[PDB]
Design a binder for this molecule. Structure first.
Ligand code: CLA
Ligand code: CLA
Ligand code: CLA
Ligand code: CLA
Ligand code: CLA
Ligand code: CLA
Ligand code: CLA
Ligand SMILES: CCCCCCCCCCCCCCCCCC(=O)OC[C@H](CO[C@@H]1O[C@H](CO)[C@H](O)[C@H](O)[C@H]1O)OC(=O)CCCCCCCCCCCCCCCCC
Ligand SMILES: CCCCCCCCCCCCCCCC(=O)OC[C@H](COP(=O)(O)OC[C@@H](O)CO)OC(=O)CCCCCCCCCCCCCCC
Ligand SMILES: CC1=C(/C=C/C(C)=C/C=C/C(C)=C/C=C/C=C(C)/C=C/C=C(C)/C=C/C2=C(C)CCCC2(C)C)C(C)(C)CCC1
Ligand SMILES: CC1=C(C/C=C(\C)CCC[C@H](C)CCC[C@H](C)CCCC(C)C)C(=O)c2ccccc2C1=O
Ligand code: SF4
Lengths: 743, 73, 131, 80, 146, 40, 33, 132
């Protein structure tokens, strides 16, 4: 009948604790029982690989839907806890009254073992750990005002968490959807693009227009939090709103009529940052979401469902083919509607890419009240979202490779774009290799050249703004374009989207919130290094996807799998030739890439933006503008950045920042610890274990689960894990400790 | 690099480079007499250990000398 | 067909650490170390293919191929001894009204082709040659 | 190139000859085992040194041992 | 329409006939380049190649070298270029020895010892002379103003 | 019940419980007898 | 004068010598006796 | 009799023209799509098929795939630059996994792996323990 219908099987899986007591039930091999320690590790590594646990897409699909509900439940509990801790263990009320002086804190340590030192004198007759997630600013923007409200949102969160968990159980054990239900992309996109995003934005705009905007205006004006009317009061008494925004008097009459102009009071396109709080005007944010909402809702009506009108994605994809691309995009629809791994690849890459964009756009255009001046929170958020993004992007590549090895079928892909790509893979990889070498030699060479020149007493031969100069002309041009846009290419706007492009210095509380950021030779040099790092990462990852099934070296790599240790010592050596290993190596380069980016942000900002400005025009940046002539050499980074900005962590003992010092050291230890897994091999360890077991046997006792050394692949994984934790952890402490002081 | 990255990856990459040289005009005129191949397993281990060792000694040598001389001399 | 063409190579097995020439030789008789590309109207790799107006891509012009007819011969020559052993055993087992090994071969291979002949047990052969 | 040797502990499981990626091993008639078959390495000139064969042997200690040695184009798996 | 086809109609060769690889433009340019052109003797082939490469090499040294701002900068640039040409010439000599051997016969085949030696000689003369020409040209630069 | 008890008898679960107990008792001892570098 | 020796020998030891040595090694390893 | 393929950059190189080359042949009952070791997809012809590769392993890998299609009549040859051809697999007409009377043992040692001689004993001999 209808193309789109709901098909669900009742009572699919019985709920019992029997399987719980039978570890390894999901796998046929593991189910037999443990005979060596490898079984234990394998149990945990194959837990969520449903494709290998079952051969039916319906079953795999059912598990994924329910598992997702589980994650949602966890996320809800997390958010709930944060709000609760902000209601019972925080100084929000005090901060709300004096946001500039009091420091945000929402965690308190018990008075055990001198750990109390960690409870700092943040302010407002309160002692606790200074948090840096930015909760206080967000709550202020929403218009919380009280701590009772925080408690209630916490309760809502707990309730929501439970509902999600029930949903997971219900849709797996009692009402499990069939495969036909899952395979309805057009419907899903229509619903998610119009309901989840469109209605979501519209609903949020409602809160912002009726509750947040009014309260925040009063707060900024000076009204004491206690004197601001309760949220419900604004919703009921239109007169009160009319006082603040003199258009609510007209009511919704202007809206139904075409006179949307009358609502210019609260819907505006001002641009720039609020002078008092140093954040984007909420009026603009309200119009933003309202506009986006309309767009999304309209977009949700593009695909056919059950009424004839609409587009069928298959047709659109197949029609787009050209002279240089054979059958074009034929075959892609089936792949994306019959392979979860393929979908995850695209989705995961885009999600990670978004996080990186959020990081850039959220510092240049501060979105929350009193966020820019809080340097600690700004740095924390930028770095946090930069990382999340990197991991996700690499993950997308990984799952893309899993697709090629597990779901790719030659029959369904003849002369399509995918086939043609795999037919000239040598050309693609060869060229990218060259691009990477070119960029790397030229970009890093600049730094080495400068180091040598400065050391040889020849400063006039350096690539600097005072010698041979490499100016970023293109970027400088775009900046000017964006600066002059308000009033020209953007006539109805009133100010620059960001003061970074150009403008005046916005200061809040004697501290600089935003200032024009200029680009010179040093910036050129660093930006091109970023390009090199990203390009190399792509090379490793793309090579893995393209050569996943076969290679000149190992023609039958596909049969070996996605995660095999090697093929042997032959052919000169075939170690680490799997696609999994390419992901393994890619993560190391992603670490390098992100590390450089976050360091660039930290030094540039502390040198050319952040700081204090006097009543008159005197700007004193935190580091003093050293970036221009010091970041052009490697010695400069080691001395004027790492060595100098690390004075805080190393001298944190005896203070509330002591934890960071300990973690800094601990992270270094873990990083080094990992190098033993990354440089050694299973053979040595297995033999050592044999001798150790001899001792236990000599005393008449030994485990039946014979002790064995970690697999080759696991060894690499353990090493990478500790390596990443240690490296990121070290910077984490370094940044946070430094930031607390600079703030 | 030599210690953590192993042969398989590099061998495949070198193969692509061979293809390029043989297919790029002008450079085709010149050719090798010893087939280009990746370093062996043990060789890489040795090369890596040497790089690690040389850097280790050199860095400390500078510190012990510059630090002592710069302060007391 | 020179069945020893491959064996007749420049490779000299070492004392210890070498399997040897094996069954079909360890290396090609010809040396891979030939020259590179040459100007239009010239040849480089001895019996190379003229690149015509595109000498740069001359190495992509194939000159080495397999004739299907010739392919049959190589199959027969390299498997001659096996066929001999097979027919010999068939002869040993008191063939019905046997004639000559060669004659029997022709008769037995006239039917059951040649490949099938090579893959059949003496028992099956005797059953087949009952007539 | 490489050297592959078979020992008397073979049981004629044929697993090794079914794993070689380059047809270096064969199953020949023999009387030392119940199966009446033993493995041989007639064409070691094509061994790449994968050691897949060894991984397939079921005997306590490999009855088939591959000792890596002199390297040739074939043994180094060079398609170029 | 397919603008990419198997090279030489061999579906199994490791190459493809793309617009870049096989277009009238590419074919024409490569056919008339000194390296592949028809009729040129080994010496002349080297000469043309050398004349071309020497002229553009004096620039990098002259404008970005250690003594660029010195009055004798151009002279220094010339000397540096000559040095680089010598290094490249050594390479050519060594390559020939290894690739071709010691006694040849075919003759007039760029890929023989005698021909290679002649080619190398031409390169040296052309390169050094070309660099000198650039020195003379860069000594006084025309403004082409009426 | 029997099956649940088996799950609670699994190695990972038992370790966590035991270590939590051990950690707790150590913490409690330090809470009531703090700062000791020797048996007095 | 011996004082001029540093400026006459160093150019040779660090440039001419290494070059010729490398060339000879290449010719030696690329030859098939 | 070449299968239908549109070309790839993963085909053979100079070695195939100056050192050595390989070729596989088989017969099919239907036109079907297979994946070639070089990279890509091709359609076999209804009948005889011939394909050239640069390595024996590449050829034998394809044979494995062919067996899935129920094709067991494949033959592999090595063509030298001069035109000489060597029949390589199935060498005796019978697949190696099946014992064929008439095949002799090679490289066999009549003792357990642990009975090989001690390295010191064969010092300054040139032979190895496993060859001793
Ligand atoms: C500081 C350590 C270090 C360095 C320098 C490199 C260097 C390199 N890695 Mg690497 N790597 C490292 C650690 C390092 N790795 C570690 C720890 C790992 C483990 C995860 C890896 C894993 C890894 C992989 C998996 C990959 C690389 C790749 C690369 C290459 C990138 C191409 C390039 O930029 O060439 C330029 C190289 C330079 C060193 C630039 C500096 C050299 C000077 C400044 C330029 C001019 C010098 C000139 C050429 C010669 C001067 C003559 C005279 C000095 C004698 C390059 C050779 C990629 C590759 O090979 O693709 C191309 C690749 O795929 N790396
Ligand atoms: C993201 C979630 C999250 C996180 C990380 C924290 C973290 C923290 N909370 Mg908090 N909290 C949260 C959510 C969260 N909370 C929520 C949602 C609520 C509302 C209910 C609260 C309510 C709350 C209160 C009321 C208090 C805290 C406190 C604390 C701090 C001490 C935690 C503690 O009890 O240590 C000690 C840990 C324990 C006592 C638990 C014992 C350890 C158990 C037994 C181990 C688990 C057994 C294991 C799972 C067995 C498996 C069996 C199998 C069936 C699974 C710590 C910083 C305390 C604090 O800061 O005091 C100053 C405090 O008083 N929180
Ligand atoms: C108490 C209620 C209950 C009971 C008795 C069962 C019982 C069962 N479920 Mg089920 N399930 C439930 C609730 C329940 N479920 C809920 C609420 C969800 C939604 C999330 C699911 C989702 C679900 C899926 C998707 C699957 C099962 C499966 C199974 C069967 C195998 C048990 C197993 O895999 O052990 C699991 C035992 C564990 C202890 C795992 C717990 C792991 C936790 C939740 C991770 C998070 C902990 C922490 C927060 C993260 C680290 C810190 C078994 C019949 C599987 C099966 O056999 O299907 C045929 C299967 O594929 N269930
Ligand atoms: C308009 C209807 C609608 C909405 C709102 C959603 C929303 C969602 N779907 Mg979805 N879906 C829909 C229709 C819809 N779907 C249809 C028709 C199909 C079949 C074609 C699917 C098939 C589908 C699959 C297969 C999956 C999803 C998933 C998801 C979640 C993605 C994760 C996320 O963004 O977290 C955002 C989280 C929240 C916003 C939390 C709230 C979530 C609740 C359920 C919102 C419900 C409305 C709420 C009660 C508000 C009522 C308004 C009232 C107050 C006035 C998200 C909650 C994924 C998932 O994780 O599911 C568990 C997933 O795997 N959907
Ligand atoms: C949307 C996110 C997402 C989802 C749903 C999946 C889902 C999946 N991935 Mg995948 N992946 C992702 C993101 C994701 N991945 C990202 C971002 C990366 C890049 C790092 C990868 C890299 C990756 C690889 C390389 C592999 C998978 C595999 C798998 C499959 C099995 C997972 C498994 O073994 O479970 C078991 C899960 C675990 C054992 C994880 C436990 C957590 C470990 C111990 C790390 C914990 C670190 C912790 C945070 C540090 C705390 C520090 C503290 C102690 C001090 C499954 C389909 C595997 C597979 O076979 O696919 C078919 C596989 O080989 N993925
Ligand atoms: C890789 C990056 C890099 C770059 C660009 C430079 C650049 C420079 N260095 Mg330096 N240097 C570097 C790394 C680098 N250095 C490193 C890593 C070290 C440490 C060993 C040094 C140590 C060093 C010293 C000790 C000295 C220099 C000097 C110089 C200058 C002289 C340039 C010269 O003679 O080149 C000559 C260049 C060429 C002959 C060729 C250039 C490449 C050509 C243009 C490529 C053309 C490609 C073409 C477009 C392809 C398409 C063609 C098609 C269209 C037909 C110049 C500013 C000298 C100086 O005075 O300093 C200012 C000097 O004394 N350098
Ligand atoms: C002990 C060895 C040694 C010596 C003596 C020199 C000497 C010199 N180097 Mg140097 N260099 C060395 C090792 C050495 N280098 C190494 C190992 C590296 C790699 C890191 C470099 C990389 C390097 C760069 C990147 C640059 C130099 C430059 C220079 C020159 C700067 C002074 C001057 O007046 O320039 C002005 C130049 C002149 C006045 C021209 C002098 C005449 C030339 C040198 C004649 C060369 C002909 C020579 C015989 C040909 C060799 C034949 C072959 C068979 C060996 C100077 C001649 C700079 C330069 O200008 O190069 C020429 C420059 O840009 N060097
Ligand atoms: C030239 C003939 C006359 C030169 C003369 O009279 O010197 C007289 C002039 C002297 O010019 C000098 O220039 C210096 C730098 O500016 C000084 O500052 C003075 O101007 C000056 O005294 O010599 C020249 O500079 C011009 C000669 C240019 C030679 C052309 C290049 C020829 C090829 C050279 C490479 C040879 C290697 C192999 C060749 C194959
Ligand atoms: C980039 C320019 C561009 O987009 O060209 C696009 C070019 C022509 O595409 P077609 O119009 O023929 O094919 C259309 C379909 O692919 C759907 O758009 O495709 C290529 O061949 C890319 C070649 C590799 C890219 C070289 C680097
Ligand atoms: C981009 C492009 C292009 C290209 C360009 C180029 C690349 C150029 C180059 C150019 C060049 C690169 C040139 C060169 C020239 C050279 C010369 C002009 C030389 C001369 C010399 C002479 C004349 C002589 C000398 C001598 C001798 C021989 C010896 C004795 C002495 C004397 C001195 C006499 C075109 C436009 C096409 C188009 C588009 C693309
Ligand atoms: C980069 C890298 C390579 C490739 C590195 C190569 C090919 C080094 C090439 C450059 C060196 C400096 C040799 C270059 C020599 C010159 C061409 C001059 C030679 C002259 C002769 C006469 C000696 C491996 O082969 C490898 C193998 C196993 C594990 C890791 C790796 C690895 O990390
Ligand atoms: S090592 Fe590889 S090629 Fe050699 S016999 Fe064993 S499986 Fe065959």
């Amino acid at each position: 009948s209808k193309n789109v219908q709901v098909f669900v099987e009742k009572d699919a899986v019985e709920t019992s604790f029997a399987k719980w007591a039978q570890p390894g039930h999901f796998s046929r091999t593991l189910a037999k029982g443990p005979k060596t320690t490898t079984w234990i590790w394998n149990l945990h590594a194959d837990a969520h690989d449903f494709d290998s646990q079952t051969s039916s897409l319906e079953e795999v699909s059912r598990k994924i839907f329910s598992a997702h509900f589980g994650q949602l439940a966890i996320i809800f509990l997390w958010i709930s806890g944060m709000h609760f801790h902000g209601a019972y263990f925080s100084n929000y009320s005090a901060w709300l009254t004096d946001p500039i002086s009091i420091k945000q804190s929402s965690q308190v340590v018990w008075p055990i073992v001198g750990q109390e030192i960690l409870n700092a004198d943040v302010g407002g007759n309160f002692q606790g750990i200074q948090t840096t997630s930015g909760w206080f600013q967000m709550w202020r923007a929403e218009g919380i005002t009280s701590e009772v409200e925080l408690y209630w949102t916490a309760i809502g969160g707990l309730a929501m968490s439970a509902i999600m968990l029930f949903a997971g159980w219900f849709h797996y054990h009692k009402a499990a959807p069939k495969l036909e239900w899952f395979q309805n992309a057009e419907s899903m996109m229509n619903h998610h693009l119009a309901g989840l995003l469109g209605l979501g934005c519209l609903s949020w705009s409602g809160h912002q227009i009726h509750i947040a905007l009014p309260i925040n205006k009063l707060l900024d004006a000076g009204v004491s939090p206690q004197e601001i009317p309760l949220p419900h009061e604004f919703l009921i008494n239109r007169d009160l709103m009319a006082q603040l925004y003199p258009s609510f008097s007209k009511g919704l009459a202007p809206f139904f009529g075409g006179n949307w102009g009358e609502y210019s009071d609260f819907l505006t396109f001002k641009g720039g940052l609020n002078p008092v709080t140093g954040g984007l005007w909420l009026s603009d944010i309200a119009h933003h979401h309202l506009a986006l909402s309309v767009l999304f809702i309209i977009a949700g009506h593009m695909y056919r469902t059950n009424w004839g009108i609409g587009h069928n994605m298959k047709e659109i994809l197949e029609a787009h083919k050209g002279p240089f691309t054979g059958e074009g995009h034929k075959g892609l629809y089936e792949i994306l509607t019959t392979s979860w791994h393929a979908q995850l690849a695209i989705n995961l890459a885009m999600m990670g890419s978004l996080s990186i964009i959020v990081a850039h756009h959220m510092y240049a255009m501060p979105p929350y009240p009193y966020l820019a001046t809080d340097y600690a929170t700004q740095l924390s958020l930028f770095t946090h979202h930069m990382w999340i993004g990197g991991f996700c992007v690499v993950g997308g590549a990984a799952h893309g490779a899993i697709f090629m090895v597990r779901d790719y079928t030659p029959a369904n892909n003849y002369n399509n774009l995918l086939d043609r790509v795999l037919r000239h893979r040598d050309a693609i990889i060869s060229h990218l290799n060259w691009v990477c070498i070119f960029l790397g030699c030229h970009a890093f060479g600049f730094y080495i050249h400068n180091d040598t020149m400065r050391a040889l007493g020849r400063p006039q031969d350096m690539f600097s703004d005072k010698a041979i100069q490499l100016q970023p002309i293109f970027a400088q041009w775009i900046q000017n374009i964006h600066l002059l846009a308000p009033g020209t290419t953007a006539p109805n706007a009133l100010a620059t989207t960001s003061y970074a492009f150009g403008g005046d210095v916005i200061e809040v509380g004697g501290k600089i919130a935003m200032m024009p950021i200029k680009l010179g030779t040093a910036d050129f040099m660093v930006h091109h290094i970023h390009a090199f790092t990203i390009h190399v990462t792509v090379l490793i990852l793309l090579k893995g996807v393209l050569y996943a099934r076969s290679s000149k070296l190992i023609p039958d790599k596909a049969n070996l799998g996605f995660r095999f240790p090697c093929d042997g010592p032959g052919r000169g050596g075939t170690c680490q030739s799997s696609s999994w290993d390419h992901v393994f190596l890619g993560l190391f380069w992603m670490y390098n890439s992100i590390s450089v980016v976050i360091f660039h942000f930290s030094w540039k900002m502390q040198s050319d933006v952040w700081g204090t400005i006097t009543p008159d025009g005197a700007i004193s940046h935190i580091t003093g503008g050293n970036f221009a002539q010091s970041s052009i050499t490697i010695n400069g980074w080691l001395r004027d950045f790492l060595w100098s900005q690390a004075s805080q962590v190393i001298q944190s003992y005896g203070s509330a920042s002591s934890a960071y010092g300990l973690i800094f050291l601990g992270a270094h230890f873990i990083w080094a610890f990992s190098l033993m897994f990354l440089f050694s091999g299973r053979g040595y360890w297995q033999e050592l274990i044999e001798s150790i077991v001899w001792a236990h046997n000599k005393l008449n006792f030994a485990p039946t689960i014979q002790p064995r050394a970690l697999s080759i692949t696991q060894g690499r994984a353990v090493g990478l894990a500790h390596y990443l934790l240690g490296g990121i952890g070290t910077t984490w402490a370094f940044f946070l400790a430094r930031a607390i002081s600079i703030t | 690099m030599f210690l953590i990255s192993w042969r398989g990856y590099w061998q495949e990459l070198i193969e692509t480079l061979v293809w390029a040289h043989e297919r790029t005009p002008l450079a085709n005129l010149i050719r090798w007499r010893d087939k280009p191949v990746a370093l062996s397993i043990v060789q890489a281990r040795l090369v890596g250990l040497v790089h690690f060792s040389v850097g280790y000694i050199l860095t400390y040598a500078a510190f012990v000398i510059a630090s002592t001389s710069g302060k007391f001399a | 067909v020179d069945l020893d063409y491959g064996m007749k190579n420049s490779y000299v097995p070492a004392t210890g650490g070498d399997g040897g020439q094996g069954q079909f030789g360890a290396q090609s008789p010809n040396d891979w170390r030939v020259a590179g590309t040459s100007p239009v109207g010239e040849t480089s790799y001895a019996g190379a293919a003229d690149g015509g107006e595109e000498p740069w891509f001359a190495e992509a012009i194939s000159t080495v191929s397999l004739d299907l007819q010739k392919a049959d011969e190589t199959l027969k020559a390299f498997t001659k001894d096996a066929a001999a052993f097979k027919i010999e055993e068939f002869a040993a087992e008191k063939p019905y009204g046997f004639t000559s090994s060669d004659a029997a071969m022709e008769e037995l291979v006239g039917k059951l082709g040649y490949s099938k002949f090579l893959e059949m047990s003496t028992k099956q052969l005797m059953k087949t040659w009952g007539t | 190139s490489h050297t592959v040797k078979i020992y008397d502990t073979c049981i004629g499981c044929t697993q090794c000859v079914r794993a070689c990626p380059t047809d270096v091993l064969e199953m020949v008639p023999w009387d030392g085992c119940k199966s009446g078959q033993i493995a041989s390495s007639p064409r070691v000139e094509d061994c790449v040194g994968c050691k897949r064969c060894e991984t397939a042997c079921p005997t306590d200690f490999l009855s088939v041992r591959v000792y890596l040695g002199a390297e040739t184009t074939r043994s180094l798996g060079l398609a170029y | 329409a397919n603008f990419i086809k198997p090279y030489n109609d061999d579906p199994f060769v490791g190459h493809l006939a793309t617009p870049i690889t096989s277009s009238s433009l590419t074919r024409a340019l490569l056919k008339n380049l000194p390296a592949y052109r028809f009729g040129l003797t080994p010496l002349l082939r080297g000469l043309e190649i050398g004349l071309a490469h020497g002229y553009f090499l004096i620039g990098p040294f002259a404008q970005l070298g250690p003594l660029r701002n010195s009055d004798i900068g151009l002279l220094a640039g010339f000397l540096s270029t000559i040095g680089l040409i010598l290094i490249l010439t050594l390479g050519l000599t060594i390559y020939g020895a290894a690739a071709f051997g010691q006694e040849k016969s075919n003759g007039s085949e760029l890929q023989t010892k005698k021909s290679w030696d002649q080619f190398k000689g031409g390169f040296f003369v052309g390169a050094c002379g070309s660099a000198g020409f650039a020195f003379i040209c860069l000594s006084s630069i025309p403004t082409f103003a009426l | 019940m029997n099956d649940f008890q088996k799950y609670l008898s699994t190695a990972p679960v038992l370790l966590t419980l035991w270590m939590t107990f051990t950690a707790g008792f150590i913490i409690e001892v330090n809470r009531f007898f703090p700062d000791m570098l020797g048996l007095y | 004068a011996a004082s001029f020796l540093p400026s006459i020998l160093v150019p040779l030891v660090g440039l001419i010598f290494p070059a010729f040595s490398m060339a000879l090694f290449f010719l030696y390893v690329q030859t098939d006796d | 009799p070449f299968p239908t393929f549109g070309g790839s950059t993963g085909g053979w190189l100079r070695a195939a023209e100056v050192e050595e080359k390989y070729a596989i042949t088989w017969t099919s009952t239907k036109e079907q799509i297979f994946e070639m070791p070089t990279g890509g997809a091709a359609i076999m012809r209804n009948g005889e098929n011939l394909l050239y590769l640069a390595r024996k392993e590449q050829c034998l890998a394809l044979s494995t795939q062919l067996r899935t299609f129920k094709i067991n009549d494949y033959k592999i040859y090595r063509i030298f630059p001069s035109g000489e051809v060597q029949y390589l697999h199935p060498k005796d007409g019978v697949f190696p996994e099946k014992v064929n009377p008439g095949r002799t043992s090679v490289n066999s040692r009549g003792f357990s792996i642990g009975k090989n001689p001690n390295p010191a004993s064969i010092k300054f001999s040139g032979i190895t323990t496993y060859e001793s």
